[PDB]
Design a protein around this ligand. Sequence first.
Ligand code: 43V
Lengths: 243, 8
Amino acid sequence: ASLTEIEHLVQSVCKSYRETCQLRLEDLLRQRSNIFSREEVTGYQRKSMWEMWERCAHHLTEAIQYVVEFAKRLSGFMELCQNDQIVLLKAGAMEVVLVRMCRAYNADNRTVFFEGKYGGMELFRALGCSELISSIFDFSHSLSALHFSEDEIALYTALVLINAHRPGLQEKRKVEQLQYNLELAFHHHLCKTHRQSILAKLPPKGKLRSLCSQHVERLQIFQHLHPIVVQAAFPPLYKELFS
Amino acid sequence: KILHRLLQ
Ligand SMILES: CCS(=O)(=O)c1ccc(CC(=O)Nc2nc(-c3cc(Cl)ccc3Cl)c(-c3ccccc3)s2)cc1
């Protein structure tokens, strides 16, 4: 409740994000010419549905683990009760990764960083969920048009996580208070940097929810086809969040 | 279970 306090929250959030961002932006940018060839692409398409699902679930889990660490270092998160921490992470971890993903997306040729190189949505054809894949690509394309700075991603992803509307919260008002302070920090930073134009261009929450629902739906379809693969070869954290 | 472990 003072400029100095809000500004302190902005830097805290930005720091917490930097420490848990998984890959540095520069590293991702340096690799943009490193693109899968036609032969490697064909190689991905020839892989079994279940091998590809397993690999995607593994990489999603790695990314989620960084988001979990982000939350632990996020001012006020650990002071919430354990029930609410779990509720917020279960609902928001995937949404945060989806936002973070625009950093690894190349709008100029419509590719994303995956297993050491950049590839287009055709790389994922073996998954058998083309609607989900192109929606994530489209979502990433829309976020790329905003030209997020890292600090903006830090602040926005903090708010994606700290959402007082999540069902199952026991200390709703306490999450409301933290949410409000992070909104002030985000919006103060946007005001300071003359970037409040992006507020109206941020995707609605229903878009993020739609992507997460589709992901869960397509997992369910896949798990019905290969139940022992999920039981035997999917990461436990993934199954906990999504099964 | 896993999420609980990561947080603690
Ligand atoms: C996120 C933090 S970072 O920017 O530092 C970073 C760090 C590592 C990586 C490499 C990686 O893991 N790429 C992946 N690409 C997709 C992906 C991306 C699109 Cl646009 C469409 C379809 C897919 Cl499958 C993944 C995926 C898997 C399962 C479900 C949903 C998504 S994982 C990328 C980014």
